Structure 1
């Protein structure tokens, strides 16, 4: 244990103001700058179809779990050096948690 549920709501506002600019969560939503993330958990890194991921992601070969996703979220360039995710990070444990709670939810 090292991940505890957050507010899906709050969850859904970080996404909007922090991840939508680049991504969609929804089954059938398109890839934009980043890929769509519907069904992200359970799946491995860089496998959405019709998406051109860096060498980095693919190689990283990550199992998208909640616990992973949080450290990634802490610092992505750090997690997967060579990723094209120009996303600095979410330094707060709390913020991450609501986010992941939202993700857990909306991409299922």
Structure 2
């Protein structure tokens, strides 16, 4: 995927999320209603500290799931469906109220990039 493009596309995410490095550096100063995305790639889902996630995503991580660019790219398009399928639960609910139409892989790549 394209990171250069992903950064530009992150415009749909900053409304709720931010990209903040461990020493506090503000890579992307966004909102605090969604968890910090710095390092999400490789991270077990629904585990960022001091963040109150909806249940399903926490269950997904409890099952051993860590995000990849690929899944990130997919989830982003339809979070709730993503979950229902992963969890094999028709009843899986998402706390993320946005579906991105096009851009997943790029945004996915960007996110991977950010920690280099």
Structure 1 length normalisation: TM-score? 0.80
- Structure having the larger proportion of residues in strand: 2
Q: CA deviation at 1:54?
A: 0.8
Q: Aligned equivalents of 2:54 and 2:80: distance in 1?
A: 12
The residue matched to 1:36 in structure 2 has which SS?
A: coil
Q: Aligned equivalents of 2:79 and 2:53: distance in 1?
A: 14
The number of residue pairs the alignment matches comes to 99
Q: CA deviation at 1:74?
A: 2.0
1:79 aligns with 2:93: no
Q: Aligned equivalents of 1:19 and 1:72: distance in 2?
A: 13
The answer as to whether partners of 1:76 and 1:89 remain within 8 angstroms in 2 is no
1:10 aligns with 2:18: no
Q: In the TM superposition, what whole-angstrom CA distance separates every residue of 1:29-63 from its partner, at most 9, and x where no partner exists? A: 58711000111111111111111011111012231
Runs (4+) of structure 1 exceeding 6 A deviation are none
Where structure 2 has 5 or more consecutive residues not aligned to the other structure, the ranges are 84-91
Matches within 5 A, 1:50-69: 50-61=50-61, 62-69=65-72
Change (3 A) 1:34 1:107: farther
- CA-based RMSD: 1.9
Match of 2:111 among 86, 103, 106: 103
Tell me what 2:45 maps to: 45
